[PDB]
From a paper:
Peptide deformylases (PDFs) are metalloproteases that catalyze the removal of the formyl group from the initiator methionine, a critical step in the N-terminal methionine excision (NME) process. All peptide-based PDF inhibitors share a common mechanism of action: they bind to the catalytic pocket of the enzyme, thereby preventing substrate access and inhibiting its deformylase activity.
In contrast, the accessory PDF, Def2VCH, is encoded on chromosome 2 as a monocistronic unit. However, Def2VCH shows a specific pattern variation in the amino acids, described in E. coli, as responsible for ribosome binding. To explore this possibility at the molecular level, we determined high-resolution crystal structures of both proteins in complex with ACT. In both structures, ACT binds in the same location within the catalytic pocket and adopts a nearly identical orientation and conformation, blocking access to the active site located at the bottom of a deep cavity in the protein core. In contrast, Def2VCH exhibited a different binding pattern. This is mainly due to the substitution of arginine 97 with a tyrosine, which weakens the interaction with ACT by abolishing important hydrogen bonds between the NH1 and NH2 atoms of Arg97 and solvent-exposed oxygen atoms of ACT (namely O20 and O27). Additionally, in the hydrophobic pocket containing the ACT P1' aliphatic chain, isoleucine at position 86 and leucine at position 125 in Def1VCH are substituted by glycine and phenylalanine, respectively, in Def2VCH. These substitutions likely contribute to the variation in ACT binding affinity between Def1VCH and Def2VCH, explaining their different capacities to confer resistance to this inhibitor. Conversely, substitution of tyrosine 97 with arginine in Def2VCH led to a marked reduction in the MIC, aligning with the resistance phenotype observed for Def1VCH.
Residue numbers in the entry:
A (entry chain G): 13 to 180
B (entry chain D): 15 to 174
């Protein structure tokens, strides 16, 4: 068990390549901690383990209004995608910066659910975008990596200020 | 398209002269814009960087490079909230280092037809204006760095 902190850029732990999970029983506590941490944010809808400094390939998502529809993805991978479009994204690890990012709008993701059983999600919903964002975190990528150098400097400046001025 | 000078070049250290006749510098403004838009990566350009002593700056922070900002006789009249931020410079190519700037500024200037302009900003534009305006008094951002860092800068420029 752990108290998890959401890390913010620039922090090299956000750039680590995640490790595949080979012992699903061993990550149940982390999954519940990740869910609690996501549910403690005002606005977050997903969270990836590298964002709390853990190297396991684990993502949690909850798109629901009441936050009672948790989705847990272990070892997720995009196995098909098509129909790229631009859409605004923000990130708990790049707080207070938002920009349009290109993603597939139809995707199939394969993973294990939290009990270790095979999971295959086929979606053209906003969930497709959210899964791609979270899966990017597992390869140490942030959405600002797709932007121009000027926009990346703009983002880092905004993050630094938001983090410095955050209230307790 | 004009040529951008690199340090060490005493023309980068010239104190710029105020512009009193806006019509006579209209050709230079378009020349500065063409020269900036011919760079791979630049977002602003000051007249001393093309060997001219007139107090003129051009800036474009847009993705498509279709929102030029032209500043004649620009002056920082207020600033607050100094912070460190990375800068690079077309006149110190391939050198990047953290430098202190105001993150909230008020700049007074004239637009390209001479009417008064007052820009109050806490955005990234604040940094770019300060960097460009520094060029007009013959300052490069490396002047604010330690001697060891300045020594390094000169080596990097030469290799470019
Ligand atoms: C949009 C694609 C990614 C969503 C996941 C992120 C959280 C995150 O960084 N996951 O790695 C999020 O909730 N981002 C929020 C976000 O961008 N949201 C919240 C839902 C709508 C959208 C507004 O841009 C911000 C406010 C932190
Ligand atoms: C950053 C504040 C001032 C920037 C202005 C300079 C140009 C300059 O030398 N003006 O006198 C620029 O475009 N610099 C570029 C720069 O540092 N950039 C380009 C946009 C983002 C940032 C780092 O990538 C380099 C690559 C030449
Ligand atoms: Ni994110
Ligand atoms: Ni410069």
């Amino acid at each position: 068990s752990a108290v998890l902190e959401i890390l913010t850029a620039p922090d090299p732990r956000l750039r680590v390549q995640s490790k595949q999970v080979t012992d699903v029983a061993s990550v149940q506590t982390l999954i519940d901690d990740l869910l609690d941490t996501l549910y403690a944010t005002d606005n977050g809808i997903g969270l990836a383990a590298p964002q709390v400094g853990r190297e396991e390939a684990i993502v949690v998502i909850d798109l629901s209004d009441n936050r009672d529809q948790p989705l847990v993805l272990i070892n997720p991978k995009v196995v098909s995608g098509s129909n790229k479009e631009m859409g605004q994204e923000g990130c708990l690890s790049v707080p207070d910066y938002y920009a349009d990012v290109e993603r597939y709008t139809s995707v199939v993701v394969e993973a294990l659910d939290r009990e270790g059983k095979p999971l295959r999600i086929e979606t053209s919903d906003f969930l497709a975008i959210v899964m791609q964002h979270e899966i990017d975190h597992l390869s140490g990528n942030l959405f600002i990596d797709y932007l121009s150098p000027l926009k990346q400097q703009m983002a880092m400046k905004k993050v630094k200020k938001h983090v410095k001025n955050r209230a307790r």
